[PDB]
């Protein structure tokens, strides 16, 4: 299903997967929350800057040949927190191997001082 | 990198932990709420009948073969919502398994106060 995807936190899961799919670093920053947390494949990268200055621009790469279908997508708000768990097909190639697969990802979101809901914990695999 | 792990919230996720690795089902079964979801290996369940009606068995038969060793927990309590955090060495084997494992919990208190898992994302 599709559930919650119009609201406010939404709007930032939306444009942060299309950021990151199209290496757009404002938007990503933008989008996660200095000290975000964000797990894959058994190593935790634990602030903005650190994912930025070791991985994120490995995961723009690794996007850059691959369409990303949204096969599901719910987000449930519960006052100042937001949990988004979405489920997308993944194609294309990188570095020469095909990729053909689930992705799954499980976001934490919060809203910020000022109202801005920020991604404060990333899932994926 | 153990921050709130004796919380209320912290004691279901002990619980739970604890229930798979012993094969307790009663006790997984009021770890996780009616309609929780699970996320694992690209696949979803979407209840607690139908997670236990088979994947929870196959989950308690891995288990009984691994050693899990915390190697982080965090647990963060935003009013009913609680959020659990955790990477974890698997080492063993079934049918060499030597591997980091993760996992992320979200519970929610229920009207009766007790936590109650509503989605799980394992890796």
């Known amino acids: 299903a599709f559930i919650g995807v119009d609201s406010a936190a939404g709007n ?25 947390q964000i797990y894959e494949g058994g190593k935790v990268e634990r602030s903005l800057t650190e994912y930025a200055n070791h991985h994120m621009l490995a995961d723009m790469a690794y996007l850059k040949g691959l369409t990303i279908t949204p096969k599901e997508h719910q987000i449930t708000i519960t006052g100042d927190i937001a949990i988004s768990t979405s489920i997308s097909h993944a194609q294309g190639e990188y570095k020469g191997k095909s990729i053909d697969s689930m992705t799954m990802e499980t976001l934490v979101l919060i809203k910020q001082a000022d109202g801005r809901w920020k991604i404060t914990h990333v899932h994926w695999s």
Not at 12 to 35: D, P
């Open 12 to 36: 930032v899961v939306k444009q942060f997967h299309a950021a990151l799919q199209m290496g757009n670093e404002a938007i990503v920053r933008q989008s996660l929350a200095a000290n975000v």
